[PDB]
Amino acid sequence: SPTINFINFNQTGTCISLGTSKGFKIFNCEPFGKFYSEDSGGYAIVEMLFSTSLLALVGIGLSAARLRIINTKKHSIICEVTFPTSILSVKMNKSRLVVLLQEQIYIYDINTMRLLHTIETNPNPRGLMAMSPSVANSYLVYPSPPKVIKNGDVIVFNLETLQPTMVIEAHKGEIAAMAISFDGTLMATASDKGTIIRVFDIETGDKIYQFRRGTYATRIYSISFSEDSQYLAVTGSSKTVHIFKLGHSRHFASLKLPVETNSHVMTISSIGSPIDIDTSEYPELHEPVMKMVPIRVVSSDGYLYNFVMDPERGGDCLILSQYSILM
Amino acid sequence: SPTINFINFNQTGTCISLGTSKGFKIFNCEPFGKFYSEDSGGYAIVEMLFSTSLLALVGIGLSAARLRIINTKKHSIICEVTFPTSILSVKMNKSRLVVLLQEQIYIYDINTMRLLHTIETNPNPRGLMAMSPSVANSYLVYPSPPKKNGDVIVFNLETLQPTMVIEAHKGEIAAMAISFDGTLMATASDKGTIIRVFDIETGDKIYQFRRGTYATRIYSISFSEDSQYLAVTGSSKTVHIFKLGSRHFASLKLPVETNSHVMTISSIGSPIDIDTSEYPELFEEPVMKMVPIRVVSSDGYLYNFVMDPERGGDCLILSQYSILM
Amino acid sequence: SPTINFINFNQTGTCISLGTSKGFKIFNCEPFGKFYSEDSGGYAIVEMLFSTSLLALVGIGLSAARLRIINTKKHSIICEVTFPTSILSVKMNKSRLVVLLQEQIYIYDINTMRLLHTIETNPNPRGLMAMSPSVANSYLVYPSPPKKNGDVIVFNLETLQPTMVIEAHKGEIAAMAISFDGTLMATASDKGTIIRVFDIETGDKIYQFRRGTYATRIYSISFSEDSQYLAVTGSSKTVHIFKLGSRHFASLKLPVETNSHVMTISSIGSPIDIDTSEYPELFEEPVMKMVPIRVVSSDGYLYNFVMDPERGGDCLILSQYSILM
Amino acid sequence: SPTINFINFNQTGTCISLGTSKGFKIFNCEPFGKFYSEDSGGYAIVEMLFSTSLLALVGIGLSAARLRIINTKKHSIICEVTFPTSILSVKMNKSRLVVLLQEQIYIYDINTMRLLHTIETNPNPRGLMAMSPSVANSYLVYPSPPKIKNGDVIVFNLETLQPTMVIEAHKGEIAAMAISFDGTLMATASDKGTIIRVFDIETGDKIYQFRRGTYATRIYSISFSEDSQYLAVTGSSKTVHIFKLGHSRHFASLKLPVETNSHVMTISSIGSPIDIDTSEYPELHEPVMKMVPIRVVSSDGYLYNFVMDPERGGDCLILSQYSILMD
């Protein structure tokens, strides 16, 4: 079992990208399967578009600075670009491509692949961004800390016109995680203490909802919206995943992984559209079928966990099944 | 407690073959006991014939490519054979020995050890094959993906020629098994919701079963000795039973306290009599006919369940013994 | 007159490929003439595509194992590939290149020249196959004798996977052919009395024809372009015609003065019009439509017969041209 | 095309044995096919029983002296017998095994394989023999030249291992001899091949006398039909004559195609009458009439099929032609 260095969903949440120390793999979610794989080398960044057989591959250090775009269906190379320093994050929509270094942001047109803009920002060792995947509201947000209280300043940048729109005074402390909804309407931010989750409306700039997370301060790994912006998912070092309902404070529903799971695991999640599930097979505790929101939680140890949430009841969520990635 | 790497029944379901990173062990089912053990090294595949003191040893990486056949009664080594790639699966009957690799299938005569035929197949990353254990209808079935996804090649080991090709499923095949008499074949798709049972002689689809209301992958399928029941184990920690006389006939619910990071297989035995007086709390006619079901998981526990042949339903657990100890 | 070693039509029946003990020749059918010739050496297998200046060269023993692909217009060699055993047969379509050995079948991409797949088959000492020349329905068939005698494996060249197995005949297979569109299949046993036509899509027996009242082995089978007629050639110095619309439709009787130590192949072409004025002495309307039939024999003579699509019966002979001269 | 050194039918005429310079082959007649083959080396004598998977192989020199008997179904060796001199002929029935050297005849029991008898005969450079294949009338006949009394033949009974009578067959040396299937008759011919005589082995009286050809020419082999109706002689004239024993001049004659090389050994056999379709074959009409089939194989490696009209006789039509080498 080789070590894995990178996991993320696609922009719709129906696929899996993964990077090992020996290669990368691509999975699927509902009819689970292994679409692609190569045992080329160490990969640190494997990001995919809305299917479409387009990938961004960054070597473990193929150096960490180099970025390679590969079409998996054609097994060809669209392009190859180098950077002076190691790449920290890569994100895409169907219009723009963004590469972030520790102090620089590069924006590329996805089609022509020519460089469009460059932003000189204050250092971001954590490689934090958030990209709206829709071209109607294509926005990029990146933190702007003072260069050495106003440490949690974030810059709202419009990719369409390549000009910033506004500056949001998000938090007092440094930003730890950022997420933009599918339509590019909302943005959610998390401080380094992970106690307060704040979501802002990107066009107006007003803070709409504020969530309290857990009991004591602890690190936050990632944030992600639902497809319909109904729920927000956060995962932290407490080995617990919280769901906040944006249909409008305290977390709406909580995901407790099995006890045998290691505590030192990076956990990312995703929320899918509600589906029909049979209550005859699963004693939820009864009509034969009821809609339950499926949640997929893949951890850095290499396992996938499927949960269901009742939108009215909420509460602690039942776990249906567990696969094992890399097997 | 060393980690285990291989767990499997024998061709009759009356034994447990288990190989650890330190050695291998051979158990029994009804009179539970430790028949044999050796602390030699890491073993990846330990396959046994119908008792008869015959074993096949595959090293964890003894390499994974190398295959060794030993006799436990005489403590001797029959032969050793190497392969260009890692060994993925091995199955045996009283006439033929077959070794499956990533893209090749090797067929051996179990008596002489001479090579008989080699099949060039499209890649099988899951190491999937199924063998009829009876020499009367000695068949081999393996999937044929395109290089039309669930094509299964019914290969006749008796004359070393394929017999027919069945379009089993539209998607990838996940698990295949052949009955004890070699008459029927069962397969499950990669989405693990529909079970299809084929007549290996003609290829007609006979039975179709529903299972796995949500996305729970199917791992293993097994027939009973009389082929009356079909057992499917998935990743949902629940085992379904289908009757070959649609909806499942009976279900197995492992206790919740068990480790969830486990791989579970199962096998159904011939009906036996159980004593009520031995079990005062649960299951309380001094003796009743109940079909025994044995489920072993990778965490090292053997579970015994019993089902009422008429009522079915959720099955009780009589016992839970501890392998590796 | 150096002895010839190989005779074959092209995939359409409008050309002649012939190989001598001294070189190879390429003829034509309707305007009979010598298209090409080379005095290089002995050639045992000369196969041509649909014109396109592409040839397959196999040495007599260039050895029998080596295969050379040459372009006659550019006078250059595309590639040369060797094989462990002697080459038994070669067939082509516009997308795939197939080389058959005694126990193996090699499949190549006719464009990239890269090896695609290799099939392990039971020994075929006669070098038998049949290949569909149309890329749309590119199917390959080859016999599968036991190591159940007339089993032929239907192999899909497009996806490189077998599709189905048909129990063609109870005895050993003697000759096979596939129509131009790759839809139908024809087989003949070693008895030479029964001709069976199969549908590749389903596998059903479509037609059954009677032939060869005595022991005359069948040598070659060929479909017409429109698949209206099927011609079989044997060792009896007679060629029968069957209509795919029981008893044979028409028959060809070679002249008695010809050599008897001959192997004749045939290929039925598209119907054409013949001039009656050119032939006053035989067959006496100025012109009438007549289906041409071309029979070339190993003695070095090409024959042209014509059959009336309504009357059938014995076919008149128009011309007898001398190949190799 | 390898050089072939030996061709013989089985005792029933339904099979073909053959030996090349590289190995031996076994064919069949009605459903023609290659039952067996073996690429060992030069084989000089290949004799077979009534099918039953029993063969006798004599190497060209496996020296010419050595005799090896093999079961082809089991691919095993029964026994090997060595002799001081080269073997000239071997014939079998389901009871006895006979080995001829130039001056010695050895008789073995086919079952227990123990030696039974040995006859010291005057030299036979041509290795001539005729052996009855039926155990009810197991007889052996061999020539007895002096050391005018040249064509004397010794009638030897294999059952009791004693000579029965001496036949004063011909004035000159005997050239060929054969016995009917039931062991009742015997036919011999002198080295001139002008007179064919038939003697009854029971009494010794000459029954039939046939004239063959006009000028003295060599004779290769003589063979009866299975029903003892006809007798077949083959010679250097590239022509095969058939004499009707239902009772002088040959009843019907077989002419090979003119292309055939004239320096070819030819052995023939007559089969049981069967039905043929006159609709397909313009015999020049009832749809079917019974035609007696004759199979003629030549040393060049070809087989010829003729048909004989028992009433009309005359020159026989030829239906088909194969190749025994290659296929």
Residue numbers in the entry:
A (entry chain A): 5 to 65, 70 to 156, 222 to 321, 409 to 445, 458 to 499
B (entry chain E), C (entry chain C): 5 to 65, 70 to 155, 223 to 320, 409 to 447, 459 to 499
D (entry chain D): 5 to 65, 70 to 155, 222 to 321, 409 to 445, 458 to 500
From the paper:
Autophagy-related protein 18 (Atg18) participates in the elongation of early autophagosomal structures in concert with Atg2 and Atg9 complexes. Atg18 belongs to the protein family of β-propellers that bind polyphosphoinositides (PROPPIN). The corresponding primary structure contains a series of conserved WD40 repeats forming the 6 or 7 blades of a β-propeller fold. The autophagic membrane adapter Atg18 reveals an unexpected structural plasticity in multiple modes of oligomeric organization.
In an effort to improve the helical order, we imaged the previously characterized Atg18-P72A/R73A (PR72AA) mutant that has lost its ability to interact with Atg241. The corresponding Fourier transforms supported the same structural organization of both helical assemblies, with an improved helical ordering in the Atg18-PR72AA mutant over the Atg18-WT, indicated by the higher diffracting layer line at 1/6 Å. D Fourier shell correlation threshold at 0.143 indicates resolutions of 3.8 and 3.3 Å for the 3D structures of Atg18-WT and Atg18-PR72AA, respectively. The helical symmetry unit is illustrated with alternating blue/white colors (pitch: 100 Å, number of units per turn 5.1; helical rise: 19.4 Å, rotation 70.0°). The T-interface includes R285 and R286 of the FRRG motif that are in direct contact with blade 6 of the adjacent molecule. The I-interface is located between blade 3 and blade 4 due to a 180° disc rotation a pseudo dihedral symmetry including in a small tilt of the two discs with respect to each other. Notably, four T-interfaces are arranged in the characteristic lozenge pattern that was previously observed in the COPII coat formed by Sec31 tetramers. In fact, the T-interface buries the PI3P/PI(3,5)P2 FRRG binding interface and shows direct competition between PIP binding and tube formation. Similarly, Atg18 phosphorylations in loop 7AB can be expected to affect the stability of the tubular assembly, in particular, as the higher resolution structure of Atg2-binding deficient mutant Atg18-PR72AA tubes suggested an increased rigidity over Atg18-WT.
